[PDB]
Amino acid sequence: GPYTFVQQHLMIGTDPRTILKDLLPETIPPPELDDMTLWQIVINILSEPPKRKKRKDINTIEDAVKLLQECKKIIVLTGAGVSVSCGIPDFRSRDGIYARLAVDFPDLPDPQAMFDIEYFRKDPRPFFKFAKEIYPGQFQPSLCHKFIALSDKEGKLLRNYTQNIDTLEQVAGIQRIIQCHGSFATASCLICKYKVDCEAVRGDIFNQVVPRCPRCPADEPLAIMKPEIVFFGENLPEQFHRAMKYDKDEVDLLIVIGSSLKVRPVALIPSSIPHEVPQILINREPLPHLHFDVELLGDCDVIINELCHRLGGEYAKLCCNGGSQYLFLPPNRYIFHGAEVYSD
């Protein structure tokens, strides 16, 4: 380890600048820096994991349509952005569900607390208020969903990893799907593990009644029916790990659509595949913590619409109907309608 390396040098009295002189061969560190600070610099450099770097030979949207044409075995990684046009609000964007939950739930600190098992046991109401709004059986899938669906029908889709729990890909026709965070397909008692299908609890959910276990004693408060939604701290489904094992050496193109990639281990997928594999981002905001080759920024629907028209054939039969307005920032970044980075 790098850490051990520095420890041993500390036992000897080594000057960190001696190690940094050839670890940073062209850079001398500012005079007013602590010795230990310098040693920490050494640790970070030595223990920096090999990262994928942006491919210099892939930049343009024309390059993107080229990849879409010639690639079989595509991985598409979707997030909440892909469903906001369907009528399902974001976490990241302006006026999410949290703005309305914080109104009469003062104890709810963040959107992520809805998927916190401890908070859930304390008060499951905010979760089930969310569940009613997002519950399957009420929304039509977007152009993106249809796009991914067509890719699968054409045999080009290796897999669609989704973080979404709206289960809209079932409607769209995306069969090669992995629901990385589970769904509302079943619900189970926290206490006795009594399992039940999605329908059994739906009634209670739309009546704003917390679905309770009918087998456990009625006085037992934690006897709640929780849908198989993966909560934080919990394990991702077996399918996820099994699929990534096969897919990591099969993929020849990665597309990320409508996600901020802030949740692991799904956010590690761009880091888990071969460095030469091209990576395209389709998203309202850029993601500086990753190195995408082509950055298409805006509403994923209007971008996908543009991509489909350029692809012709079956793809052009999907979209709403010339090109689409964008600001191009060389070498690889495009700003379409709807692009925004929200803050206040």
Binding site: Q112, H181, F232, G233, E234, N235, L236, V263, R264, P265
Partner: peptide, 7 residues
């Protein structure tokens, strides 16, 4: 293990 974590 890779557990669902906010990073």
């Amino acid at each position: 293990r890779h557990k669902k974590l906010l990073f």
